[PDB]
Structures are given as structure tokens and as C-alpha cells.
Point group: none
Amino acid sequence: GGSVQIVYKPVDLSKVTSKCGSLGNIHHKPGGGQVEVKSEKLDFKDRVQSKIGSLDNITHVPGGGNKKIETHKLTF
Amino acid sequence: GGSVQIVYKPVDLSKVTSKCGSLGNIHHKPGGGQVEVKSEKLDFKDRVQSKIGSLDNITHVPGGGNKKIETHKLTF
Amino acid sequence: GGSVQIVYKPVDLSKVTSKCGSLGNIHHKPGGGQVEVKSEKLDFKDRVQSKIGSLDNITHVPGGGNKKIETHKLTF
Amino acid sequence: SVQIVYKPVDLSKVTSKCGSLGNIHHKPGGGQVEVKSEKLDFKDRVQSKIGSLDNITHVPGGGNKKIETHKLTFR
Amino acid sequence: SVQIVYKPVDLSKVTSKCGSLGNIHHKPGGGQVEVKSEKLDFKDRVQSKIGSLDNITHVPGGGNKKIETHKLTFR
Amino acid sequence: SVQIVYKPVDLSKVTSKCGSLGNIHHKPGGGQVEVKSEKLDFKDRVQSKIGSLDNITHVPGGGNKKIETHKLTFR
């Protein structure tokens, strides 16, 4: 007769990904030969940042966040 | 007769991922040869940051967080 | 008779990805030969940033985040 | 009637003289050696050799090979 | 009637004289050597050799090879 | 009637004299050597050799090869 059949059957197989920062790099034998600083006085004051012959790897990742809002609704 | 059949069967196989920071890197034999600082006096005052021949790996990750809001609703 | 059949069956297999920053690089034996700074006096004041013979890798990633909003609705 | 005389003769020599043979070194003189090294940096393999007087012989070859095949077929 | 005389004779010589043979060194003189090195940097393989007097012989070859094939077929 | 006399004679010589043979060195003199090196940088392979007096002999070749084929076919 008036048979009603409903199949609410969605499928979800997605991917949300974020790759932020320093990923998969290769640093092979870095470094300088000779660094020489000769003086008579070093006078650093009031927010001095000094680097002599150093190797730095810095990474700031304030972002890279994911979000996923998904709703479903079957009204009758 | 007027029979009703409802199959509310959503399937969810998703992935929410975040890879933030420093992942998978390769550092092979870093470092400088010779670093020499010769003076008569070193005078550092009031927020002096000094690096001489050092190797730093720094990482800040204030983000990289995931969020997933999913609602379902069947009304008859 | 008046048989009603409905099949609400979408499929999702998408991908949302973000690769931000420094990925997959190759640095092979970087570094200068000789760096020499000979002076009478070094006087740094009031927000001085000095680099002598250093190797820096810096990475800021304030963004790179994903967002995914998806709704479904079967009204009858 | 058939008659066969298969009599080869062989007196060959296969000689190899490889290297330092028969030399004469009458009072050789090594000098004075000094090696002062400081503040060095090596990032890979190193092979060092220091000395005053030296005799080296290296013979990776000098090998003999001899083949010989005889064959007498009848009918 | 058939008569065959297969009688080869061989007195060959295959000689190899490779290297430093029969030399004379009468009072050779090595000098004084000094090596001062500072603040060096090597990022790969190093092969150093310091000396005063030196005799090197290297013979990667000098090998003999001899082949010989006899064959006597009948009918 | 048939008569065959296969009688080759061989007295050959295949000689090789490669290298430094029969030399005379009467009182050779190496000088004084100094090497001062500072603040160097090498980023790849290095091969150094310092000396005062030197004799090198390198013989990568000098090998003999001898082939010989005999054959006596009948009918």
C-alpha cells in the first residue's frame, strides 16, 4: 500500500590536515670555517642581541589549527 | 499498508590531524670550525642576549589545536 | 501502490590540506670560509641586533589553518 | 693401416718479476721531521702518515694464466 | 697406408719485468721538513702524507696470459 | 700412401721491461721544506703529500698476451 521507505545513509571519509612549521628538511654539515672577533672592549646595553658563529633553528607556529562543523537533520 | 521505514545510518570515517612544530628533520654533523672572541672586557647590561658558538633548536607551538562539532537530529 | 522510496546517500572523500612553513628543503654544507671583525671597541645600544658569521633558519607560521563547514538536511 | 704419433713437446716458461727486485740502497738518509698542528677540526675520515725514511712496495697484479687444450679425434 | 707425425716443439719464454729493478741509490739525502698548521677546518675525507725520503713502487699490472690449442681430426 | 710431418718449432721471446730499470742515483739531495698554513677551510676531499726527496714508480700496464692455435684436419 502506501509504504514509505527512507534510507538516510550519508558516508564521510574526508581528511582535514595541516602541516605547519619545519617538516622533512635536511641540514648536512652546516657551519662556517673560522669566525674571529677581536676588540678591546665589548659594551652591549639596552636590548642588544649578539650572535657570533652560532647556528639557530627557530620555529613559531601560532596557527595551523583545524576546525570541522558538520550537522545532520532528518525531519518528518 | 501505510507502513513507514526509516534508516538513519550516517557513516563517519574522517580524520582531523595537525602536525605543527618540527617533525622529520635531519641535522647531520652541524657545527662551526673555530670561533674565537678576544677582548679585554665584556660588559653586558640591561637585556643582553649573547651566543658564541652555540647550536640552538627552539620551537614554540601555541596553536595546532583541532576542533570537531557534529550534531545529529531525527524529528518525527 | 503509492510506494515512496527515498535514498539520501551522499559520499565524501575530499581532502583539505595546508603545507605551510619550510618543508622538504635540503641544505648541504652551508657556511662561509673566514669571517673576521677586528675593531677598537664595540658599543651597541638601544635595540641593536648583530650577527657575525652565524647561520639562522627562522620560520613563523601564524596561519595555515583549515576550516570545513558542511550541513545536510532531509525534510519531509 | 693407419699410424698416428701425437707427441708434442713443451718447454715454455711464463715468468713474472713484479716489484722491487735487486735494488741497492747504500746509506740512505732520512731527515728530521716536525709536525705542529693546533685548533684543527675534521668532520670526516682521516688517514695520516708521518715518517722520515720510507720504502713501500705494492703489487696488486703480476699474476700468470696459462691454458692448453689438446684434442685427437678419429672417425 | 697413412702415417701422421704431429710433433710440434715449443721453447718460448713470456717474461714480464715491471717495477723498480736493478737501481742503485748511493747515499740519498732527505731534507728537514716542518709543517705548522693552525685553525684549519676539513669537512670531508683527508689523506695526508708527510716525510723526508721516500721510495714507492706500485705495480697494478704486469700479468702474463698464454693460451694454446691443438687439434688433430681424422676422417 | 700418405705421410704428414707436422713439426713446427718455436723459440720466440715476448719480454716486457716497464718501470725504472738500471738507474743510478749518486748522492741525490733533498732540500729543506717548510709549510706554514693558517686559517684554511676545506669543504671536500683533500689529498696532501709533503716531502723532500722522492722516487715513485707506477706501472698500471706492461702485461703480455700470447695466443697460438694449431689444427690438422684429415679428410
